Write a protein that binds this ligand. Sequence first.
Ligand SMILES: [Mg+2]
Ligand SMILES: [Mg+2]
Ligand SMILES: [Mg+2]
Ligand SMILES: [Mg+2]
Ligand SMILES: [Mg+2]
Ligand SMILES: [Mg+2]
Lengths: 213, 89, 251, 226, 59, 207, 90, 180, 256
Amino acid sequence: GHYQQEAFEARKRFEESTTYPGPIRAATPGDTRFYSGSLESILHDTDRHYWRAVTDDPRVQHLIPLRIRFKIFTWVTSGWEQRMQVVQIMAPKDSTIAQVKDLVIVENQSPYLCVSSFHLAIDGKELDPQKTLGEYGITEQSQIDAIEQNDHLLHRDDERPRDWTVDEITAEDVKRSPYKEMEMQPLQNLAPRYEARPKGYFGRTYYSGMKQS
Amino acid sequence: RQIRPYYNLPSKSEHGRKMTGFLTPYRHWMWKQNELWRNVHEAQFEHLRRVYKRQWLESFRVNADEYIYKYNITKAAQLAQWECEMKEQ
Amino acid sequence: SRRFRYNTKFPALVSYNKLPWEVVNHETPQFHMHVAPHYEQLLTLAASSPVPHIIGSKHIDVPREHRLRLLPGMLYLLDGDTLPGEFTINRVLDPTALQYYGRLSSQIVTVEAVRMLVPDDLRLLCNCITFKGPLHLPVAPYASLASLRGASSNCFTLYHFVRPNRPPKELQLEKYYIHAPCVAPLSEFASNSDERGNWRPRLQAPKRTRRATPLPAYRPPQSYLMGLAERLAVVPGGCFGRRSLMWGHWF
Amino acid sequence: RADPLNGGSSMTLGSKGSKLSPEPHRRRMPWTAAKEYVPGVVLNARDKMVLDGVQLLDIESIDRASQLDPLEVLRAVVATREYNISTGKNIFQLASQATYNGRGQRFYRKEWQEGTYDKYVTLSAIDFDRDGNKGTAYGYITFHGETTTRPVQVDFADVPGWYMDFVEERAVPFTGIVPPPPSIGTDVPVDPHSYRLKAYPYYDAPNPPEFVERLLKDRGVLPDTP
Amino acid sequence: EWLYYKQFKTVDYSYRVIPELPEKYRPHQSGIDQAPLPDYREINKMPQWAECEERRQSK
Amino acid sequence: ASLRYRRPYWMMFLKGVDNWKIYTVIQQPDHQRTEMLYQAWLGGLDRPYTRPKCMANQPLWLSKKRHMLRKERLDGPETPLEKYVLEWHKKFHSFQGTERPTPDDLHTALDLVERPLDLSYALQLLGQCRNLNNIRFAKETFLVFLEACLRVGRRDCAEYALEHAEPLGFWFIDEDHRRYLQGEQTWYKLSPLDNLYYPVEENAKLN
Amino acid sequence: FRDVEERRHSRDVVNELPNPWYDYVAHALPFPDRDAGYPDEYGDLGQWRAPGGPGSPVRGPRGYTAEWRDLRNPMRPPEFPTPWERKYRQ
Amino acid sequence: ARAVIKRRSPQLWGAPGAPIIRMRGHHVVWKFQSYDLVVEHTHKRRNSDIRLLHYLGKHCPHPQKSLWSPDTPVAQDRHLFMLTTVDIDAFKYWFGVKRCRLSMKPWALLAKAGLLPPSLTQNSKIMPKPLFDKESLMRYYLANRKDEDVMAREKYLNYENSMVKTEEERAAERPVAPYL
Amino acid sequence: ERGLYFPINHRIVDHRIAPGVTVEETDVQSRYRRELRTNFATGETRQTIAPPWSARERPTHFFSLRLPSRNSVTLRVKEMHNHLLFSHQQCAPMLVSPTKLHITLGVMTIPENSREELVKNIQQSMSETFACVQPLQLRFRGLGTFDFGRVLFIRVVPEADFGRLERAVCDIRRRVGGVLGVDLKGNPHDSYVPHVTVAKIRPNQRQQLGDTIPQSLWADYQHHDFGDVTLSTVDLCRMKGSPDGYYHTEGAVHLS
RNA sequence: UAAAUUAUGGUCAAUUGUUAGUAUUCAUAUUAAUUUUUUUAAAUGUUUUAUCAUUUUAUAAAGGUUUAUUUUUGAAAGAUUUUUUGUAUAAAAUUUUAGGAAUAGUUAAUAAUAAUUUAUAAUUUUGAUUAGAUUGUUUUGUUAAUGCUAUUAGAUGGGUGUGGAAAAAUAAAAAAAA
Ligand SMILES: [Mg+2]
Ligand SMILES: [Mg+2]
Ligand SMILES: [Mg+2]
Ligand SMILES: [Mg+2]
Ligand SMILES: [Mg+2]
Ligand SMILES: [Mg+2]
């Protein structure tokens, strides 16, 4: 918005200064890992956990915290839900989109995400695995999605996983994949016990951007 | 409570409550009237709410900045006293 | 209710209470539900002022390689009916789908046909809407659509490319909500019009000797009602308006 | 919060209302949204005394010994039909009788046309599930000569409160598309003789005299002798 | 109303319906066996009215 | 008065289900083998079985398999009509059916009558087409039904359909079809090909 | 209602008279304006001590100054010859 | 949101709710009984001190003879007295800024004091509750309505800032010669 | 079961993500302790940073303490090379030859026109600054990284005569950059971090070598002790690698 | 290392046993208590709602804890056409038994690792852990007084995890959406 161009322009004018001595690092503190409160809070790199009244010199950001979005199928008791999971890397400024894929693959801790090949895309347009973040104007604020192989098949009943509510789960597939891990047959402590949202939660029509009634 | 009269729409059900709140148009009109009257009351009531709010804010301004007057004088005095004690030191 | 600050409660990996991510299925009527009211706005824009990529001379051609990094999101209008190459043709005859194009066909160009085109590899989509006849809007001379023969040979088509099963964001219609004035009503007073002399001003309100005819006497409704819609927080119709104003609800 | 009754005025709990806002008060429960509802209990509640002295069969009783006189079957069918209309008529019971499943017709619920309340629904399209009397119904809402831009699922289509009036002018074939009726302020130039506004945003109705009599005869102003 | 709800073990008299849990809640443990299979030929014998209307059909 | 805090969250908006407290305690071993026994009691399976974790209702596939393994009645079909009625229950009463009957299928169904038993069958089908399925008829519908009530030599049902045609939903009856039942016109229809009056006994005046 | 009331309220003369309760808030601050009788640093009660003493907050602090001039010798006759009683000046 | 509701002392919303000004005292023989005006939360615990925002005062509901003042031949003064202590800075704070609620009995009290108008529950059963019709009200309103700016300024002075600066104190506060 | 239910190291809030997002819309997952991993662990060091205009131009000359013959340092660095090359021989182009080992006291850009005025003037000021300073015994242990892990060096511990260095350097810093305006890549009011550069990746090399020296090589030598050295000799050097087989030396000062 | 006065100020410290050679707080005293007496408590049906459902209604059962108990606003208050924020879960002090010994899903680093990651680990004689007794840091009694001698009660793990917060299974005396 306004911030982005205000600070961009500020940086760009700062770089064209003929006369500047350079900052004194005894006057330019780092950040503290030690502050009150139990939680450990990660902030912007321009920001500190103490009060600093003075505005520090604009720096180019050498580690850009990209966010890459995935679609997961979350099991809730009623049936499957399709929701969103972000993976966040720190990708060096000049890095190549291939390398961004690689960093993204290493950083995900969920078993259900990276199984097949995925393509990075912005507003539905694929990115060249060949070229730099610089060219595509990728910043933290930029919205990056990720698209799997079978994702364009999800409108069918096949690729989309089958919920034991409406579908047979057989000794074929009891031993394979999220079904196996889930332990469909109830145990005393009830197995891994997944989040549940009921059937009448959204009414007769499911969740939408547009009000349908 | 919400008053449920006997001429409200009777629900014939054995699985639940015997009387659904649904109003004869008369009851609706009536309710509207009574509620107009209490509107008359609460108008003045909340009027007094915000009036007292600004009263309290204003008194806070005046007394608090009188306080800051006296207090600053005090701490200026203390600070003078200290730097003197340190010259003596 | 406001959105709470951060989630420290449940592990992130597991993600727990999350509004489902809405995804647009092209096989259902729901697709058109999303896309339609945009199209109309889009066409409206095209009727008033120019927008650059809206009008292409010919079908866009790209290699297989660059297919999915160029096409998706692209929306352009053509003069004739020619269906994009390597696209399986689906006729939309199901009435529920056709239904959402109602406003667009009545108050803008009549919709002759709708087509769902899916690429053979199945990962791309083209929504193709064929309009018949001239706009029911007036068309500006400097406007984009004035460069088209199908408006102002009377058929012409809108083409919209998209990926299947994506959120109703990355079909890009929201860039188009730029709003330009239709200058048709003032065209009367421009120095170009010869009907500007047939105009006469009313400066002063005319003397009136009669009051407005009084509304028919009020009949109080006879059936059971759900109670004050004020106290139930129901907007005046259950339709529109503010709950403070109870107008037009029964009493 | 977004839209309070009488601004915040707290002098009584009842002063707020029966719901604080139109919007759902907890975010985790969306269905708490303020609607316009309907007395489902009474309006389903179909009369079982209509089915007295009938001898219905069931669906899966196909047995030879089980079924009956064709005369008995006919009065059974008539009894069942009378049992289904016994409260009012459901949309899907009205729509199957009209041409083109009643596309284009204006469906008004009883209470929408009485008092200063004026509202109806132009039907855009219909999905009959295998069971009639149920389904989904979409259309445009028209409230006080002001119409919706896009179609919407008609709420409480299943509850039997509905009336309509068949006009050949409004009929649309399944081929074409049901146009939204014009909102009287915008598309059609406002005319007094064609359409007069029942009630407007700051208006409300005068006092009907029998209500006044009754309320005074309640509060004990006007006397009432046994 | 209140009499109706009273038959439920609701602890606070809250106008909710809470059922009980009997020791035998399902047919098989109540001693009941499988539902007896219908003799098919016996129920496919034509009814009386049908036979009478066959008698007046031949007339 | 909501059950929100009484039972597990997934049980919200639970209705019609018999003694829901059951499905609260099903995790416990004895309740679980109780359910094995119950599913075996319901039958239709090869193996010892139990419904999945938090489900109160039975699975769609399972009850579907229960429905399709359930043997239909009428093991003896003789008339073409009975065959067609079994096919009719197959197609249109199938568990969770999307499809719905057509007036043409009812004409077809109604043309296969011979004995009065088949009249009762076809008529109950018609009963389901009006009341259950809500299907508008055509003009020729009353033609069909009428000639059908003639074939079996019961004309009571025809005039009983006339005196009230609104509940049965015959929205058009040609006036001559009324006359034939009221007794005014000896004949209901003339077969153009035959150039004779129907029925034949009335056509005895035409000869 | 509000209007009729404002009218008959402004019409009566016993109003237009300040009401201490209705008009203002005397003190908004949670702490008092001056020290009243609370135990001291030694634990002694309000009655046992008077404020303003050594426990109180401190007051703090070539040529000739302006305080040199106002001063005058008792030997020289002063400014306006105010008839002091000899006993008092003693 | 309690599974088995505490049946005897229900409330509205979650606890602790919006602060409400209550009158409460331990129950005893009527001859000695006093009450406490207290700003506290909506949901009380066993001891009322756990949720207690402020202590507004003591109120003794026993008419008393005034032996503090000298016996006065004035008629009205020798009616019995009813004694109450109000903390009105805290009251105006809590009620005004914090937006409290009010039970009815304290309302009657503070009405007697002149802090609030008489409550909703104080009924002369002589008069009925009024009727209303919009056209008559409209005629009265068209008859009397003040100017827009007058009204806006009245709302300004009552709700927003009261103390304002006359031109004089401006002229007296603006700097003189050496920095002017 | 073998520890805290929620391990304390795993409790992390990301405030660089918008409020409300993590509660409803989506959850954000990341390995958060790669970033939180500190300056001691990673081995980074914060050097005086250049103003952009100075950052544009290559440095030409630098101040150096010359290591004498027969060092503990040179010996142990040779031992370290042996070990590293036996582990991974992909290091071979990264490593600096033991012949070029020197202590870098500061870096500077001299333009080629004013060259002689500047070298004479510098040399003189340098000789005046170091006039009073006797030789310096400094201690070397530990490794560190400059320029995002591209430069790998031996730290100079502030346990010894180092203190004196700091004044000494900060004087020439205030002469060379303060008095006669010269481009010291930092501020003259700021002190440079002295170091012995061991491995380095130049721009040309970077393609075949990679963008950062993998920490797996030097992890074990990170805190290794290279020993003590006394230093009498200060040089101002221009960087030419073929003139004498040692950095070409434009000026010299003896500490005695 | 000098006295002081413009004179009682800055608001009350005041102890009561008739014993039996002598040494040592020890029977019989006063005050405070238990012995000791029906003048302050109280009965069950919480309540709306759109109907077999869904909204409102969050710390008195027991167990015996001495390095111990700690927290938000997203509910309501709450004002307003739609998005808006950040601050919190952590600690420090005070901790009992006449005769006194070892304790243990275990410390710290790594990390959304490890039922077998790495290490020369952690608690204890400055009194631990088990085990007894015991409801923790404005409440009483005696007394001229540093003391001695009381103070109830209320937070008892998890197992489809709802809710803003578990405080959620009789036992009010909290008006709970006209
Ligand atoms: Mg709120
Ligand atoms: Mg307890
Ligand atoms: Mg113990
Ligand atoms: Mg402690
Ligand atoms: Mg602690
Ligand atoms: Mg438990």
